[PDB]
Design a protein around this motif. Sequence first.
Motif, PDB file in Angstrom:
ATOM      1  N   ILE A   1       0.823  -1.208   0.000  1.00  8.19           N
ATOM      2  CA  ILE A   1       0.000   0.000   0.000  1.00  8.19           C
ATOM      3  C   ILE A   1       0.858   1.258   0.000  1.00  8.19           C
TER       4      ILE A   1
ATOM      5  N   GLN B   1       2.343   5.384  -6.929  1.00  6.14           N
ATOM      6  CA  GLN B   1       1.369   5.648  -7.987  1.00  6.14           C
ATOM      7  C   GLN B   1       1.662   4.833  -9.242  1.00  6.14           C
TER       8      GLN B   1
ATOM      9  N   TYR C   1       0.518   1.305  -8.486  1.00  9.60           N
ATOM     10  CA  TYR C   1      -0.936   1.243  -8.596  1.00  9.60           C
ATOM     11  C   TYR C   1      -1.404   1.274 -10.045  1.00  9.60           C
ATOM     12  N   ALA C   2      -0.697   1.996 -10.916  1.00 10.95           N
ATOM     13  CA  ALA C   2      -1.042   1.941 -12.331  1.00 10.95           C
ATOM     14  C   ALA C   2      -0.708   0.584 -12.941  1.00 10.95           C
TER      15      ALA C   2
ATOM     16  N   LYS D   1      -0.982  -2.176 -11.084  1.00 10.72           N
ATOM     17  CA  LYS D   1      -2.100  -2.947 -10.549  1.00 10.72           C
ATOM     18  C   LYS D   1      -3.385  -2.706 -11.333  1.00 10.72           C
ATOM     19  N   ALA D   2      -3.508  -1.546 -11.979  1.00 16.96           N
ATOM     20  CA  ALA D   2      -4.627  -1.320 -12.889  1.00 16.96           C
ATOM     21  C   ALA D   2      -4.547  -2.224 -14.114  1.00 16.96           C
TER      22      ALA D   2
ATOM     23  N   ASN E   1      -5.975  -5.843 -13.987  1.00 24.67           N
ATOM     24  CA  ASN E   1      -7.413  -6.045 -14.119  1.00 24.67           C
ATOM     25  C   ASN E   1      -7.874  -6.267 -15.555  1.00 24.67           C
TER      26      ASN E   1
ATOM     27  N   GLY F   1      -5.744  -2.606 -19.693  1.00 23.57           N
ATOM     28  CA  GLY F   1      -5.927  -1.473 -18.810  1.00 23.57           C
ATOM     29  C   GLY F   1      -6.918  -0.453 -19.336  1.00 23.57           C
TER      30      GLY F   1
ATOM     31  N   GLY G   1      -2.670   4.130 -17.230  1.00 23.02           N
ATOM     32  CA  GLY G   1      -3.103   2.906 -16.583  1.00 23.02           C
ATOM     33  C   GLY G   1      -3.120   1.697 -17.498  1.00 23.02           C
TER      34      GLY G   1
ATOM     35  N   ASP H   1      -4.908   3.757   3.102  1.00 22.65           N
ATOM     36  CA  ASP H   1      -5.400   2.435   3.474  1.00 22.65           C
ATOM     37  C   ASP H   1      -4.490   1.787   4.510  1.00 22.65           C
TER      38      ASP H   1
ATOM     39  N   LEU I   1      -2.819  -2.734   6.045  1.00 25.06           N
ATOM     40  CA  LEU I   1      -1.560  -3.425   6.297  1.00 25.06           C
ATOM     41  C   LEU I   1      -0.799  -2.764   7.438  1.00 25.06           C
TER      42      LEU I   1
ATOM     43  N   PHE J   1     -11.968  -0.458 -18.378  1.00 27.27           N
ATOM     44  CA  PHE J   1     -11.028  -1.161 -17.506  1.00 27.27           C
ATOM     45  C   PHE J   1     -10.148  -0.202 -16.713  1.00 27.27           C
TER      46      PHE J   1
ATOM     47  N   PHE K   1      -4.570   7.137  -8.672  1.00 26.26           N
ATOM     48  CA  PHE K   1      -5.069   5.775  -8.574  1.00 26.26           C
ATOM     49  C   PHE K   1      -5.166   5.344  -7.116  1.00 26.26           C
ATOM     50  N   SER K   2      -6.059   4.402  -6.860  1.00 24.92           N
ATOM     51  CA  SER K   2      -6.130   3.720  -5.578  1.00 24.92           C
ATOM     52  C   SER K   2      -5.180   2.536  -5.560  1.00 24.92           C
ATOM     53  N   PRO K   3      -4.962   1.933  -4.386  1.00 26.73           N
ATOM     54  CA  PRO K   3      -4.177   0.689  -4.329  1.00 26.73           C
ATOM     55  C   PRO K   3      -4.760  -0.456  -5.144  1.00 26.73           C
ATOM     56  N   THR K   4      -5.940  -0.281  -5.740  1.00 21.75           N
ATOM     57  CA  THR K   4      -6.555  -1.305  -6.574  1.00 21.75           C
ATOM     58  C   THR K   4      -6.678  -0.880  -8.034  1.00 21.75           C
ATOM     59  N   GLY K   5      -6.142   0.281  -8.401  1.00 26.63           N
ATOM     60  CA  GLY K   5      -6.164   0.709  -9.786  1.00 26.63           C
ATOM     61  C   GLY K   5      -7.478   1.288 -10.253  1.00 26.63           C
TER      62      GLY K   5
END
Lengths: 226, 142, 231, 247, 232, 220, 242, 234, 238
Positions: free
Chosen positions: A3, A22, A25-26, A28-29, A32, A75, A128, E192, E195, E232, H13-17
């Motif tokens: 995090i 950041q 996190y991009a 991690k985008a 998906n 993305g 992203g 968040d 953790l 997405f 972005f969030s920690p989940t994108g």
Amino acid sequence: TSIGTGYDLSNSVFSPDGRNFQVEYAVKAVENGTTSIGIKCNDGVVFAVEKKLLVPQKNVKIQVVDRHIGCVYSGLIPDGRHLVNRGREEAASFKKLYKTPIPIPAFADRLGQYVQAHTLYNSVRPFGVSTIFGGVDKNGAHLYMLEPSGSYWGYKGAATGKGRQSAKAELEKLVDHHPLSAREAVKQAAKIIYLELEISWCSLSETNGLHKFVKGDLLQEAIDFA
Amino acid sequence: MNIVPQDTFKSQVSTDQDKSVLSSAVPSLPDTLRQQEGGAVPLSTQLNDRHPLESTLKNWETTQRQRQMEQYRQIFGIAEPMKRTMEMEIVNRTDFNPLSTNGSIHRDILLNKECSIDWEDVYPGTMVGDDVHSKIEKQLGI
Amino acid sequence: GYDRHITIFSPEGRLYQVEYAFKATNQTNINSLAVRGKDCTVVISQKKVPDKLLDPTTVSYIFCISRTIGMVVNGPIPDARNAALRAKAEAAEFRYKYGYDMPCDVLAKRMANLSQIYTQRAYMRPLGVILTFVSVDEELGPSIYKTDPAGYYVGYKATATGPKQQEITTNLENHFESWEKVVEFAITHMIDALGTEFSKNDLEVGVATKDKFFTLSAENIEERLVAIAEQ
Amino acid sequence: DRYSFSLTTFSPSGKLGQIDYALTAVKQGVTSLGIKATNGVVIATEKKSSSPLAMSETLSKVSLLTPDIGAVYSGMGPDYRVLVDKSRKVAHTSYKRIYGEYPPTKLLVSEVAKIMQEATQSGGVRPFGVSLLIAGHDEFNGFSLYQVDPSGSYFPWKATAIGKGSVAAKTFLEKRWNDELELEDAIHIALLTLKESVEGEFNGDTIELAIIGDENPDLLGYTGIPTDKGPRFRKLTSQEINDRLEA
Amino acid sequence: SCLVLPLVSVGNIPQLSIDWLLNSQANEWEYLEALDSKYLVEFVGPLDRPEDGSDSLYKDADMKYSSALEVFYNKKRGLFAIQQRTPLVSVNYLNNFIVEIILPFLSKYNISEICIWDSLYAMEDENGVIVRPQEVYSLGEFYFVNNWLHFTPTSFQDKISVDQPIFKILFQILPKALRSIKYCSCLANEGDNSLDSQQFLQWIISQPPIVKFVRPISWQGAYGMADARDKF
Amino acid sequence: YDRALSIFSPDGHIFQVEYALEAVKRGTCAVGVKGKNCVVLGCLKLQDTRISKVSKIDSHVVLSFSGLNADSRILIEKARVEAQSHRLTLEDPVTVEYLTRYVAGVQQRYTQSGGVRPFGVSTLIAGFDPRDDEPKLYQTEPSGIYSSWSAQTIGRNSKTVREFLEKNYDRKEPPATVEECVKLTVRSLLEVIEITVVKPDSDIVALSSEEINQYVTQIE
Amino acid sequence: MFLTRSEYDRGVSTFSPEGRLFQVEYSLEAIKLGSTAIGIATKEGVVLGVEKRATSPLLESDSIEKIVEIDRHIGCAMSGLTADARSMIEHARTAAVTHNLYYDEDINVESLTQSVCDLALRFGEGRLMSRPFGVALLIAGHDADDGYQLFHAEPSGTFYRYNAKAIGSGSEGAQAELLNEWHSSLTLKEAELLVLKILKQVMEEKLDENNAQLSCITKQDGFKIYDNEKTAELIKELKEKE
Amino acid sequence: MFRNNYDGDTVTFSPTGRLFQVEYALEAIKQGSVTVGLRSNTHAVLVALKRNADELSSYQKKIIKCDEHMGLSLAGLAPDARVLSNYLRQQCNYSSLVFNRKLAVERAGHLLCDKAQKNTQSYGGRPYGVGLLIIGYDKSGAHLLEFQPSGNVTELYGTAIGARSQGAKTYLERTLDTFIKIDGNPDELIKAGVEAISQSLRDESLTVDNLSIAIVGKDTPFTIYDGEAVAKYI
Amino acid sequence: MLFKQWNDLPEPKHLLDLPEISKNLQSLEVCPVPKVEFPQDLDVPQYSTAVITTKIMNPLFPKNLLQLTSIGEIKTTLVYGFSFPIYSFGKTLLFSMEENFISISPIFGNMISRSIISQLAQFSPDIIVIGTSDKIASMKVMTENECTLQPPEFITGFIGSVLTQLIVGPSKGLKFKCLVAPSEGPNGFEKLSLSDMGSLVDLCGQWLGFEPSRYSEECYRLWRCDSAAIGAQSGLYI
């Protein structure tokens, strides 16, 4: 720690470990997005993706940036669209200037520089999207994967999206089996995706060095193989 | 891709072209008191028989910069001129100083003018509108 | 506080954001070596490519910046490529303005001043890379200059960089006719320091000669390794 | 976005925090010192190196600003380097190009102080984390030595020291300074002070020292204009420094 | 018998650590009682339960709702945990809340120690109580700016700050069952803190180990329910 | 919601402008009274007296202020520049309404960016239009609101002095003589002296520090 | 599940989770702070009326100017942050005069209120302003295209054609009673008396020619504001209706 | 909860994108009123349920016209709808002035896509929060594009956007086989559209004031039917 | 915008902006608590039902349709001295708290809910509660037999206080049916979508016993002509 609270709410911040959260996190985008693969042949490259009122002949995921070079991204749709269009502009300007198809490594460089520039300032966010692109070239054929960090490398095969891990594993087994013809690579790409289908390829022997869609008969044969 | 500044003459003229110095009573005419130019007598029509060099020497550096950005676009792509320009605008927009005439120390580094002099450096060259507040209002667009 | 997000001073007088930009330079595990001969400069880098799918042809952290200047970058490849394009444009601009080939140390000074900008503007992050420039200068001869994210730079007789840079540096201190011998010397000391018998593709090698800078091809690194294994 | 808030601000105590933290960064820097003699000025500092493989001949901590003026610093070397570049440029542009002669030390110090101060008003930059000792000669003001701090304040000094050793060096200078020193006496006192301030190996390659003295026509590089004046700034070679250390 | 008391503090790290504790040891903890929300912001919600699908901490049939403030008890350990779902309406009512909620509870269960769990936002250290800030954690204790609590080595605090902890320990020092105070503080940042709160709980347990951390199912909604959209 | 000009409170207030009005509430008190024939304005040991808070903007129009002195001085300078700019561009002297409108526009302009502080000053503008003899009195506020008043008070004690004026003024029996206006002004001030009388055709007099009115009102 | 502060309402660009720009909502609340304005359209004319709120009896009610001429056949009543109303009215007047100059034609009231709302857009993309206007405008006029028509301009940059509309404080009650009492056949005289009745319903101070003024649009006469004499006569006739 | 931290701008972005700030603009469409669009091969039709703020107020103009060949439908933020419509019509015009060619509908949609994407990535602005349906007829025949303010454009046979669009879209999904063949009989395509928009109604019915229609085709320039002209189709 | 302001670090979110009761912070003293007086002459037993709502919900109770009689005010003291009216109609008592995030610190609402529920637990009438929550994603029905709130969802604000005292506290077991519409905005300034308003009227009219068509039409008028909940949404969205 994934995090990074206290070093994540703004772009261009280095955390104490030198990580740009950041950017992570991009990335991690990208994890998906629709699972997408590319495969590099002996002669060329092939791309495949896992993907009712849509007009079906207009619902296409693989983007031809130029006849020279094919592109597929995963993305954020709008980020992908933007990066694709920026690459198509860069290719067209290269062609206008130097009267030759943009070398795949030069195109790759230009895109990496454009993405990377979005990591420098707090007034913008990283793209992203991770993009796999490649094509036949003056020096052969090249396959690249451009991460949202702007890091890019040449690949013999690459996969992105939710299924990227299994796709990577199977594409690596494939590479271990062939330390490929365009036909065989098409069949294996169809298989890896099955492990709707859409495929495109670029090879000197079988597309005259242009990028072309794999459609109709050969697509059905690849589905039969899968 | 220019050496000598080409585009160097105003294509259109209006009494309202000069903003920030307009009459509050009649927002169509200059404010000749706030202009402090010696009256209306510097009427805009008197912008005639300019020195042939002036229209090129004022904007020589701008033209060199534009050529440089063009060369970077041709060779390195749209990323490099974008990066250069963004850096430059960040510097210009964050250096506010109403009392100093001197150029920013970092602006010179970005321009690669750390070891360069020009006559604009050697020769850097009012009852109304000179105040710090006029500069604040220009910079914020008040 | 803000001293964590932007490059202002903390009460300690420390720019934490620059120190954290130094730690970014070791996020890749590559380490590298540069040494000087009498008339050549050699830079050795690891090339860690364990991923079967990754094409090691493209994976290079050594950049040819000018006819006579090369640099190796330690740190993330996007910022390395950014620095490379910047240095390359600056070397060309210097040549255009002053009529002679930019010296390695003047390019190092320019890039260090740019890094100072990035260490002093609030809204510009430091670049997060360490740049080692290698050249044979026409006045100074072979020379090595290394530039930090802090915008510090100094000349060196030899350098190492990366997580294990102390081991190589100490081996060089223990130590302290043609460029092929100098390459073989540097490779041998990299092996002795790191303990890894390199494959022909575990390494990349750059050479600056009196006339040009060039990178070795895999077949040249192969023959250098063979010439090492003869001893 | 048309405005950026000031990064340096007063605390409720009335103290400008970033100025205090820049002065702390100065306190953290390696010792440097300077001494007015009757017939010159000494400036000296430690060449701390991160490795023995570094080329000490490139660690130019002392730099010429004018043939009669030199500077040294403690703190952030990159800031000092940029300040030196700007101070040279301003010495030419503001003064040499107007009056045909190099500025007096007082006015170049004032220009450097002005440059350093404005980084304390800007909302885009932090202040510079360095203090500079600027030594020079002027035809009228004679030999002079100024200390410029991150605030852009400056004061003339007879002798001073900055950095880690600053307080102990200033006490050693205050006990050992006198109004009759010759330049060789000032050089000896400087070397003894730095020997007392330095950490670890004290040799002619871990130190550098410059003087403002008489003109050096052998440094002028040309002959035959008899009114023309050789530089008064002169860096001592590490050979000469070692020959001093053998005293 | 012992009590833990989560402060509503930066990153909610104390409350998140309590949710970690309760849902990881959910076989050992059970709910006992609500405490009077009088001084808290009102709150009504459903029953939370472990995301692993183990038995719920709430045990009744017709308890369909959860209070702003609740007490859980570890049957094996004599150990009590307050959960506080809302802040005080006023920091000044922190005195009233202590005097009318905590002491009548400590007496009702003859509680001998109360563990005050807190998080400090590093930017708010106007007092300068932070020392050795390289330490992420701090433990203060007391046994029956101010220097009343004694801080261990490897604690980032030299002294207490004028904040909710000073108020609490003042109005505690100003029932005979109570014997010692513990003050666990985490140097923390917003975001968040799932953790970060897990690691804080780990550090507390270091200074009954948890075999596997389990989120509450309520934390599964912490980022909304789904993407559910064509971008997405 | 307090810490920018750009932010509406959830109840629709822009608190940052109310805090500038609170800044006005701390400034030294200024009083203004319209008659039928005049407008009257009023408000350490080692001070150098030779080197009034009532500032002429033009020969026919006068501006008093309360709040921050330096802000007031900047806004006075801008008002003077505008008065002379109008008198140059158009032959006529400024209307008093035109001047107060300009001043309120300037005060509003310094409210239209979060990067600039609004002027923490309220102004009392008094005078007569050129070739006119209707007395006009106006107030401007940090928001750039402006209003016309028969009498007004601003600053430290404006509450009590205004509550006094609200009963000692009569909207339909206003003071009909200069001495009567000065009397009412001094009375209002004596609730808490300097007086300026402006008259038609650019006639303005600072009233000599005549204590006679003070003594008379203390006798009353 | 914990209560935490949500900052989605503290910035104009920020969407709320469900997609609301809450700073526009709070601009409308700032308009609900403003003094009442009432408008009623009729086939014979449009009438406007405003609550001239007064801070003190020393304030000169004859200079409150809550209703302004924009053009010979178009008027506007303000409510809210008067400085923003001044800026919008100056813009509208400039637009109207420019349209006259360039088209030899008085502006259509719809085109005018469109221009006014185009101004109110410019807190975002057409930025000019730090914040939306805290003012609603109620624009009434006559043109040869559509005749007598009344528009409400929100600071959201949207306008609606209205038959009658209340804005400002009390606008909920005033609007409910306009909705109960308005009808298509209403003649201008009784529309004036209706405006006065609604104002008396929603004004907390007693309705008076010193605290209210009326206006109408009439093609024989253009825009006009009634004198206090006629306003008092109409208030007396309203008290005679009681 | 934690969403509160990572939702302040389009730049975190969030920690989940997730990029929540764009999601909120896509939810901003759900606050819009329903509009339906459909096309055959020869004709394209838009249908929209207008709303009014109060019974004393007129209904808001929900459909527009880029030119005589293409038109547009709005749902969502009125200011952004105004911006995008002005943009789409200034592009249609510039195209005609410089080339004297009707701007291809697909090209116009791509231009909107590009314009919309910019606001998703710079800090200062905000996403447009408005969905658009574009219909037109050109050399390539009838077109229907759905625009989403994320900067996504899809060419569709039919769709709906707005609060309850899911009902109309489900109805169309059952019946696309029927309406796409409706060639040269546009009245039946309009009536099919009004039927489709007769689903997703709630406490309301279609009326000549609240209902608006437009059509374009090979033989028919872009025409809008509203008021008494709609009574033919109710 | 070219840069984000360096000074605009995220303000910490564990603290709420609730209005402080004592500008004398650091009181170190036990502070007073709002004393409440319920109107003791009210013959509450004569009403079968009580409707408890935030004044946002007033458009659900059209005065002229219900014949909503005014009733005595509830008073409070703490001086702040807030008070608000009671209403009654149709054998039904009604409470409309003037909730306000900026002025009325929720301690007032808490104590008022104590006073109300403690007055109303005796001779217990049927309780209907209509209120708001921003955390619920859609309209919910809530009653003793079923909590429809999903584990992330919860209710807070004065209606949360009412539900709290209905569920657990110094009183227990008081049967209720509670209806919450999804909302956004601070307490006292919540906004509701037209879908919420429609479902809310279409349900509460069925519970409260009105003629659905005319009641719906009158409530639609009360919502649309103006209301706190509609806000800009009539003009902000097409």
